[PDB]
Amino acid sequence: IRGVLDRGPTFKPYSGTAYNALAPKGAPNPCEWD
Amino acid sequence: MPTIKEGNSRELMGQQSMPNRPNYIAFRDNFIGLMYYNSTGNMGVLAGQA
Amino acid sequence: MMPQWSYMHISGQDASEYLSPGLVQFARATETYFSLNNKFRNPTVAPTHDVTTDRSQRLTLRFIPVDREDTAYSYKARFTLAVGDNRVLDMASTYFDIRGVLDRGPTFKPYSGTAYNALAPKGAPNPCEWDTHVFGQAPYSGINITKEGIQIGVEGQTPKYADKTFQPEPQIGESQWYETEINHAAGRVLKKTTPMKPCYGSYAKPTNENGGQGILVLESQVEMQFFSTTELTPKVVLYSEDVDIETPDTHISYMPTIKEGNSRELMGQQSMPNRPNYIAFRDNFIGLMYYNSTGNMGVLAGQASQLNAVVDLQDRNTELSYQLLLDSIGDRTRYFSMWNQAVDSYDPDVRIIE
Amino acid sequence: GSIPYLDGTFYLNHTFKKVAITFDSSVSWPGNDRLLTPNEFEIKRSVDGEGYNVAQCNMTKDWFLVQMLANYNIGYQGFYIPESYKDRMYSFFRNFQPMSRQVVDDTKYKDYQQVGILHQHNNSGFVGYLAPTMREGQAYPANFPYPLIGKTAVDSITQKKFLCDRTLWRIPFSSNFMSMGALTDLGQNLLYANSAHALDMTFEVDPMDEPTLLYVLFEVFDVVRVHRPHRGVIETVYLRTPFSA
Amino acid sequence: RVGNNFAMEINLNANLWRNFLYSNIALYLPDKLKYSPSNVKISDNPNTYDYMNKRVVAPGLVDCYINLGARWSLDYMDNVNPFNHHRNAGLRYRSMLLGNGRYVPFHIQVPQKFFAIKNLLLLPGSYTYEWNFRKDVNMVLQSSLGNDLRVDGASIKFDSICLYATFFPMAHNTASTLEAMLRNDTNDQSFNDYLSAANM
Amino acid sequence: RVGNNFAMEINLNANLWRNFLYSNIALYLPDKLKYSPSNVKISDNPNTYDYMNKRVVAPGLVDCYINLGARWSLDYMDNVNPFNHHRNAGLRYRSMLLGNGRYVPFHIQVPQKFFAIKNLLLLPGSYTYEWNFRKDVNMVLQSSLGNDLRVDGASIKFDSICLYATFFPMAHNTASTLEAMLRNDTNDQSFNDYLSAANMLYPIPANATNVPISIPSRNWAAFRGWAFTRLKTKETPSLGSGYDPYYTYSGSIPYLDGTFYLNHTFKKVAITFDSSVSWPGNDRLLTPNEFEIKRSVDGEGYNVAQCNMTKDWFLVQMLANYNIGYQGFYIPESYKDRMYSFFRNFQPMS
Amino acid sequence: NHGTEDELPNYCFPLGGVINTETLTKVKPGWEKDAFSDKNEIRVGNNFAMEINLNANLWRNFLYSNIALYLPDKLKYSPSNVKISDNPNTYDYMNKRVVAPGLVDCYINLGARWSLDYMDNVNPFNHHRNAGLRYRSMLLGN
Amino acid sequence: KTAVDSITQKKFLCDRTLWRIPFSSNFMSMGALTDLGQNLLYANSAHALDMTFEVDPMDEPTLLYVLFEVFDVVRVHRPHRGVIETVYLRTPFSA
């Protein structure tokens, strides 16, 4: 059988994050506000 | 989430991030469920054409 | 019955009997490169006579001691093992069922480390006081501070103050990471009458359903202590108290002074977890029963014979013999709780350092 | 998620209490005063009957014996670990996990105080409060949990239980519970061949706060004989007994 | 510098133990022990991933001092399906067998399991072989969290299906003789289902 | 912020390695390498837990740079009982089988191990079955530290003891017939102890190097051979007497459980019959007059397997355990190389 | 790469539990001073803490040590201001050539079971985790 | 490059096992009742035995545990109901 599958947006094959994993979980990005 | 209020403020600098829960999705062991079995409404067929 | 069973091969002959001789010959000759065996059923039928009894009969019998003698260092139990007529007993299916009470004592510690404040630096002290100086922390940020203590809110238009017995709670503090500058802070501290001990390993039983540990005498003895900056409303409020402080699984790894009593010196003492110490019955209950000891020899005799079939020598080693026997007839790495069958071993990486 | 019914990921076997089997609403099976508690199969007992348990958990001697015999024919000549090739992945022993622990006796320990997560503090000042968030609080002696060891160990009570996942409970229709052939001895008893019988079963289980299902497998013979008399012709005869279609 | 250097302390082993407990047991605890997060939008459907991902659970429920010194499964988890977990090696492997992405063009081989024909030796002739396949993602797909994939956007489409058969290149005189023998009723084939049971 | 952020550095992997070394090896080092803590009260009894728990040992004795790049057991630990350790999985499991608490109401099943009756098929009749059980905590209980449980408050009480027996529900005509057959002496049952040996213990004084033993003239027909090890007196309770007053140890008991660990301390063995005839003699071994177990540098030539064991001894042990030796040396088949076998436990080091 | 279980944050704290204490004076009730020393160290707020992702670090160190450094030489580059051998078959050369951690970082092919295309054709046995070779090496000594 | 002058040390460990010296002419196992065990030399007359073990010194009291491998057998007779008679024989080293 050949077909196409979309596991959807809830598919996450791993623990943790792929972005800035070493950054303290509360540290913000350089930002600005009023 | 420090404040419910929308928009960037000094308050939002104290928000914390957490990784989403892992969630593996795949076909089942031995492709269980793909084929119909034990269901009279969708019974398989193997018969001599003769 | 019979008809359908034979035809569907639920009973009857084996494939080697019901198949034609030609096919049977062919199957054997091709077995190695093309197998037909899994295509024909071979029935298995259990015998229907001369195996089990039709009569009423217990599978397991339980015997009570006819005589027992609990002595200084040993226990003796006598039973009348009765094997009924038309029955046989394989001794391997017998065993002594024992119920009692065990106290492993105070040196039993089934784990490494501590159960209390394991994340606290091993030298960090608990908020304390001595002679009078105070070393503490005020993590709770309240609305205002009056002679009533720290204000945790306002029920209607009236001010609601913290309940001395458990508030503020050491567990609570500011939520954001940046300093927002707290003007009315509160915290808990230990009176100088409570001995100083490192935070790590520190324990004190709670005296109220809300988690407070203040000692009762029966009323609470908590005493508020207000502090202001050296420069006149108080900025901090500390709820000092005495707690039944104990360190059940750790010991001091560094004693600064031999002198008794709380002092600034004791703030430099360090705590270390007690060594783990597992205590249990031995592998295969070795040692529980007497063997190879003429003074406490076992007994198995016909009441009609009176002669003891058991004859032991202190020259024999029954326990070891059984250890080696098991190794020869099975996988000694597997555990079986019934016989306390879990062999003694060690970590290979500990015995030989790589 | 996994579907135990189809894939075998069973995990609720520990919630069964006892099973009573009755033929023709009066005859108890196996009867014959075979089991320690003759009128039913008691899977586990709660303290009151410790004496009849084994393997250092809440399972009964009766049930341990039946399961060992049913799976490996082990029981009448001693209990021992079954051979690996017979103790497969979905077998009884391989998945049998007896367990014990102690906990404060809330009715005999004088200083007992019931404290919930809301008010327990251990590592206060170094951990977040009721969440996996930033540390907060202040250092302070922990007030939880109670010491179960040491000189000031608290009055305790013992709890025993067991787990037995990915396996099926078994009660073979065999006079001695042993496997002596696919077609059992009782299965060919004239008593069960010459006449029809009605069956009653009563299962007692641990309550669960959600809808569950009792999955019963009535072991039978599910056979087929295939005939191919001529080219392109396949004729089959299906027979399932007992419980014919 | 006069004196010892500046140092910060941390209990490595205690942390690692704790992270293991929270990740593998805490988060899988029954929903009744959890609570909704404040100031954060959370789905109303408890079968949703969003719901199972945002419900917060306190670390103190399964902290490093939980039942210290014991070999004990939490009473709360005894009745929780142990296989719906991210440490289910089998599921994890089948997941990675497809890839690490959401969009996947698959190609698989599916076996016949029906006992009456799975090991049958079929003789010469033409046969109609027909079967039905499911498209319901909650049946053909599996997740470690077990959320409702019908609601959570999982999707599947079957482009083509073929039937493959391999034949021993048997000598024709031998095949012919074997065929003659297997066509007599005395040599009829027979099979029984392994489970052999009526399921109620 | 101008520049990089504020950071602190730590070597994670080095720390974890170090903690492992200190916890599992350092703390278990011999007491002579330790020292008492200052300003802290410590017990006078070295068999005490308090003593073994407060004696301090320097991390630098087994630090992460210890014998770097080598597979080597510390010479200090070679003669230390390896089973009295918190990583002894078997002991740990039996400990958790009872619970995680100090106070434990137990319920256990104890097997009969005496060879003469353990597998006996008992016929109809009434028999008196009586046995004795020990109450000495140093014998019935086991600790990983091996401290004196008599002094350290361990306690045990036996409330009730029952005897259970299971009977195959054999057909009465069959049981009756089997009974008749088994009552004839021609069909008498017979068993032999698996170990099949007379056990002797000879004292080896501290620092003693030579151990001579002598068996007065006797009959040797049917003699099967010799087997031997070395035990520590402190770890071997005095048996025969119902209670050993000087037994202040609760660790593994090699003599009874098989946790032998001093086989590496044997140098050589000389066997002599009638004070003149050397056995096996016949110029069989490379060093014909004795069994040399190991050699020290001076005789490297006669060693093998890349360690100090001799070719002679390696050959004898391989033959004795697996009959391997006259037609090449190779790893024995797994089913013959059990847990208490020679090869499985042979660990050469350099 | 099934990621890292870093749900809970990891911190290190001051040796004394707290470090940014402020000097305060005891007070009694308006309020009047007290004399208790007039110099007491009390920290207001949470303690000083530093954060680190333990699990992510360990994963990363594993990747760099076992895969990164064994990557083909074409993906590496010579270090600046450091003397390095001309012979590529040299240990000095294989030891000083520098490789960027970002080539095999903890987010590499996340959620997949995949061998790097660069390493498929690299002899997998010439590695420090070759147990057989390691054992024969220690059999001779250290 | 600056490795220090070294010396090599070799040793071995062999836990949870027993050293063995079988009373067999070729040290091999050819049956429970060995060939030397049935040699007339050891059957027709009595002999005295001397053994000398040399061991590494230990700074504490130890014990040499010697197992003299023999036959430790029992024959059980049950002539009548409730009667058990046994015959024990251990050779060599009879009780």
Return the structure tokens found at C326. Answer: 């098991």
Interface probe for A, chosen from E52, E100, E104 (most Cβ of A below 10 Å), is: E104
Q: Which of C121, C132, C182 sits opposite G44 (nearest CB)?
A: C182
Return the structure tokens found at H36. Answer: 């030397």
* Alpha carbon distances (Å) from G98 to G69, G95, G108, G128: 8, 8, 19, 18
What is the phi/psi pair of residue C214, to 5°? -60, 135
**Interface residues of chain G, partner chain D, Cβ below 8 Å:** 7-9, 11, 13, 17-18, 46-47, 49
Contact G2 A22 (CB under 8 A): no
Report the phi/psi class of residue C284: left, alpha or beta, with left for phi > 0 and alpha for psi in -120 to 50.
Answer: left
Q: What share of chain A is helix, strand, coil (3-state, %, to 5)?
A: 0, 20, 80
Q: How far is E105 from chain D (nearest CA, A)?
A: 22
Counting other chains too, the contacts that G19-25 makes at CB distance below 8 Å and 24 or more residues apart are G19/G43, G19/G47, G19/G48, G20/G48, G21/C135, G22/C229, G23/C229, G23/C230, G24/C227, G24/C228, G24/C229, G24/C230, G24/C235, G24/C236, G25/C227, G25/C228, G25/C229, G25/C230
Contact D137 C208 (CB under 8 A): no
CATH of the domain at C212: 2.170.9.10
Closest CA to D19 of D202, D170, D171, D214: D202
Chain A residues closer than 8 Å to G51 by CB:
24-27
Chains H and F touch (3+ CB pairs under 8 A): yes
Closest CA to D225 of C235, F87, E191, A22: E191
Q: Which chains touch E (3 or more CB pairs under 8 A)?
A: A, B, C, D, F, G
Rounded Cα distance between G17 and G48, Å, is 8
Spatial CB neighbours of G123, under 8 Å, sequence gap ≥ 6: none
Q: What kind of fold does domain D1-96+163-219 have according to CATH?
A: Adenovirus Type 2 Hexon; domain 4 (2.70.9)
Domain that holds residue C204: 113-273
Rounded Cα distance between G81 and F78, Å, is 49
Instruction: Tell me if residue F121 falls in helix, strand or coil.
Output: strand
What is the per-residue DSSP string for chain D? ---HHHH-----GGGEEEEEEEETTTEEES-TT-SSSTTSEE-B--STTGGGB-TTSSBBHHHHHHHHHHHHS-SBTB--PPPGGGS-TTSHHHHEEEEEEEEE-TTT-TT-----GGG--SSTTTB-SSSSS--BS----B--S---SSTTPPPEEEEEEEEETT------S-TTS--S-SB-TGGG-HHHHSS---EEEEEEE---SS------EEE-EEEEEEE--STT--EEEEEEESS--
Chain D residues closer than 8 Å to E183 by CB:
228-230
Q: Which amino acid is at C48?
A: T
Count of residues making up chain C? 354
Closest CA to D94 of D165, D44, D43: D165
Q: Which amino acid is at E200?
A: M
Rounded Cα distance between E50 and E36, Å, is 12
Q: Which amino acid is at C41?
A: R
For chain F, the first-to-last Cα distance in angstroms comes to 55
Tokens 């027993």 correspond to what residue?
A: H18
Tell how far CA D31 is from the center of its chain.
Answer: 22
Spatial CB neighbours of F215, under 8 Å, sequence gap ≥ 6: H48, H49, H50, H51
Instruction: Tell me if residue C347 falls in helix, strand or coil.
Output: coil
Continuous segment of H or E residues that includes residue C253: strand C250-254
Question: What is the 8-class DSSP label of residue E56?
Answer: B
User: Looking at the complex, does the CB of residue C301 fall below 8 Å from at least one CB of chain E?
Assistant: no
What is the per-residue DSSP string for H12-47? EEETT--EEEES-TTS--S-SS-TGGG-HHHHSS-E
Per residue, what are the HEC states of D184-221?
CCHHHCHHHHCCCCCEEEEEEECCCCCCCCCCCEEECE
Spatial CB neighbours of F157, under 8 Å, sequence gap ≥ 6: C100, C101, C102
Count of residues making up chain D? 245
What is the phi/psi pair of residue D100, to 5°? -145, 155
Q: Regarding beta strands E141-143 and B45-48, do their DSSP bridges make them parallel or antiparallel, or are they unpaired?
A: unpaired
* Alpha carbon distances (Å) from F317 to D201, F275, F285, F321, H19: 62, 26, 13, 6, 7
CB B31 within 8 A of CB E139: no
What is the phi/psi pair of residue A5, to 5°? -130, 140
Instruction: Tell me if residue C349 falls in helix, strand or coil.
Output: helix
Rounded Cα distance between G28 and C234, Å, is 9
Chain A residues closer than 8 Å to G107 by CB:
18-19, 21
Count of residues making up chain G? 142
Contact B19 G6 (CB under 8 A): yes
Q: Regarding beta strands C250-254 and C223-229, do their DSSP bridges make them parallel or antiparallel, or are they unpaired?
A: unpaired
What is the phi/psi pair of residue D21, to 5°? -115, 130
Spatial CB neighbours of G94, under 8 Å, sequence gap ≥ 6: G88
* Alpha carbon distances (Å) from C178 to F13, F300, F349: 31, 70, 57
* Alpha carbon distances (Å) from E54 to D213, E42, F332, G97: 30, 7, 57, 46
Q: How was this structure determined?
A: X-ray
* Alpha carbon distances (Å) from F22 to B21, C114, D69, F35: 36, 17, 48, 16
User: Looking at the complex, does the CB of residue E192 fall below 8 Å from at least one CB of chain D?
Assistant: yes
Chain E residues closer than 8 Å to D235 by CB:
none
Rounded Cα distance between D165 and B35, Å, is 27
Q: How far is D225 from chain E (nearest CA, A)?
A: 4
Q: Which of C45, C173, C207 sits opposite D181 (nearest CB)?
A: C45
What is the per-residue DSSP string for E29-47? S-GGG-BPPTTS---S-TT
Continuous segment of H or E residues that includes residue E200: none
Contact F99 D158 (CB under 8 A): yes
Rounded Cα distance between C277 and D150, Å, is 11
CB F197 within 8 A of CB D106: no
CB F159 within 8 A of CB C336: no
Strands (E), F119-263: 121-122, 125-134, 141-143, 155-166, 189-192, 197-204, 210-218, 225-232
Instruction: Tell me if residue C275 falls in helix, strand or coil.
Output: coil
Tell how far CA B14 is from the center of its chain.
Answer: 32
What is the per-residue DSSP string for E131-199? --B---HHHHEEESS---TTTTT-EEEEEE-----------HHHHHHHHHHHTSGGG-EEEE-SS-EEE
Chain B residues closer than 8 Å to E86 by CB:
21-24
CB atoms within 10 A of CB E88: 19
Return the structure tokens found at F25. Answer: 């090896």
Return the structure tokens found at G55. Answer: 């699990």
Contact D115 C171 (CB under 8 A): no
Query: How many CA atoms lie within 13 Å of E120's alpha carbon, on the beta-carbon side?
Result: 23
- Cis status of the peptide bond prior to H92, with omega within 30 of 0: yes
User: Looking at the complex, does the CB of residue F96 fall below 8 Å from at least one CB of chain E?
Assistant: yes
What is the phi/psi pair of residue D7, to 5°? -100, -10
Q: Which amino acid is at E156?
A: I
What is the phi/psi pair of residue D243, to 5°? 55, 60
Chains B and F touch (3+ CB pairs under 8 A): no
Rounded Cα distance between F230 and C118, Å, is 42
Spatial CB neighbours of G124, under 8 Å, sequence gap ≥ 6: none
Sign (positive/negative) of CA torsion F48, F52, F56, F57?
positive
Question: What is the 8-class DSSP label of residue A12?
Answer: B
CB F139 within 8 A of CB F154: no
Q: Which amino acid is at D184?
A: T
Report the phi/psi class of residue F303: left, alpha or beta, with left for phi > 0 and alpha for psi in -120 to 50.
Answer: beta
Rounded Cα distance between B50 and C53, Å, is 55
Chain F residues closer than 8 Å to H64 by CB:
201-204, 211, 213, 228, 230
Chain B residues closer than 8 Å to C178 by CB:
13-14
Report the phi/psi class of residue D34: left, alpha or beta, with left for phi > 0 and alpha for psi in -120 to 50.
Answer: alpha
Tokens 């054709």 correspond to what residue?
A: G121
Burial class (CB within 10 angstroms; exposed 0-12, middle 13-18, buried 19+) of H54: middle
Chain B residues closer than 8 Å to D6 by CB:
32-33
For G105, nearest residue in chain A (alpha carbons):
A18
Rounded Cα distance between C148 and G34, Å, is 18
CB F325 within 8 A of CB F319: yes
Closest CA to F182 of F127, F126, F116, F122: F122
Q: Which amino acid is at C192?
A: K
What is the per-residue DSSP string for E14-33? HHHHHHHHHHHTGGGS-GGG
Sign (positive/negative) of CA torsion D47, D49, D54, D59?
negative
CB C226 within 8 A of CB C237: yes
Angle between helices F12-24 and E12-24 (to 10 degrees): 100
What is the per-residue DSSP string for F217-231? EE--TT--EEEEEEE
CB D217 within 8 A of CB D168: yes
CB F274 within 8 A of CB H48: yes
